């Protein structure tokens, strides 16, 4: 019950916002969804223990616009990457366009929130993987 969902259909809502309303996220009953195309924005949550082993947040979002990534520890934003396919000029490795994001191993546990909007359905697929899922990545 640690993969959460928040649809912010007013698009207005900030980092900032989100974590005053982490009460108002809801457990997924799979690692994805599919949305008719709207200006709502879609908000993820996961929280994870300490990790042990190299490990990313994998997200296959296909003609999302803007993603957003933060990542909390201690209360605190330690990431804010701010991607999508309206933000062009970024070299990303997948030819698949997937995004990943490496998630630390420094002995303490983690929130990561991610903000997607498109013009399009808003769709995405998503899941943490170690090593062994990165190498067999496209």
């Known amino acids: 019950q640690n993969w959460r969902l928040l649809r912010d259909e007013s698009a207005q809502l900030r980092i900032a916002d ?3 309303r982490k009460e108002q996220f809801r457990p997924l ?3 994805s969804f599919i949305f008719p195309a709207s200006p709502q924005a879609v908000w993820l ?9 190299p ?12 993603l957003d990534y933060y990542l909390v520890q201690d209360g605190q934003l330690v990431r804010d990457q701010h991607t999508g396919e309206s933000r062009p000029f970024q070299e990303r490795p997948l030819p698949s ?3 990943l994001f490496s998630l630390p191993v420094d002995g303490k546990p983690m929130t990561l929130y991610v903000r997607m909007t498109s013009n399009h359905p808003l769709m995405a ?3 943490q993987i170690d ?8």
């Open 45 to 53: 949550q996961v929280q994870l223990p300490a990790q042990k082993v």
């Open 55 to 66: 490990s990313w947040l994998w997200i296959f979002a296909p003609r999302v616009q803007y």
């Open 29 to 31: 009953a799979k690692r």
């Open 125 to 127: 697929w998503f899941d």
């Open 97 to 99: 366009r997937s995004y």
């Open 18 to 20: 989100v974590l005053q």
């Open 131 to 138: 090593e062994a899922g990165l190498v067999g990545l496209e």
